[PDB]
Amino acid sequence: DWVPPEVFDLVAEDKARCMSEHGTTQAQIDDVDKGNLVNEPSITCYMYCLLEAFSLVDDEANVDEDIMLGLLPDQLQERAQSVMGKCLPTSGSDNCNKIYNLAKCVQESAPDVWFVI
Ligand SMILES: CCCCNS(=O)(=O)c1ccccc1
Numbered sequence: 001d002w003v004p005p006e007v008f009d010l011v012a013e014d015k016a017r018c019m020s021e022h023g024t025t026q027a028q029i030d031d032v033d034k035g036n037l038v039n040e041p042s043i044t045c046y047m048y049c050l051l052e053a054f055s056l057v058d059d060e061a062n063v064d065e066d067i068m069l070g071l072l073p074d075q076l077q078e079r080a081q082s083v084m085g086k087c088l089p090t091s092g093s094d095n096c097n098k099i100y101n102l103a104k105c106v107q108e109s110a111p112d113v114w115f116v117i
Pocket of ligand 1: 046050068113
């Protein structure tokens with residue numbers, strides 16, 4: 001990955017909170033990173049939780065595309081922008097399910113783009 005060790009420091013406090021709130025295990029996170037994701041609230045609500053902590057989504061899981069693209073390396077932004085044209089706006093039954101659907105769409109469309117810390 002292009003994700004540097006810094007980001008792990010930066011997200012540590014929110015990561016710990018989000019996992020505690022939702023019953024998330026590190027194994028579930030590792031799985032999403034390997035492209036294995038199911039619609040289980042303990043992982044889908046974790047992803048919403050962390051996105052929200054960094055202002056990447058609002059109260060109804062609408063994505064701030066400019067902030068999201070801003071997370072990614074310059075060299076990935078062209079292809080990520082195409083992916084967001086396909087996968088946004090979000091849709092689903094609740095905030096966690098919206099992020100499930102988004103993650104599945106990004107992972108299906110682009111290898112290097114969705115990542116979960
Ligand atoms: C392309 C967006 C990735 C979303 N993954 S994440 O929810 O773990 C997350 C990563 C980094 C900051 C906040 C949330």
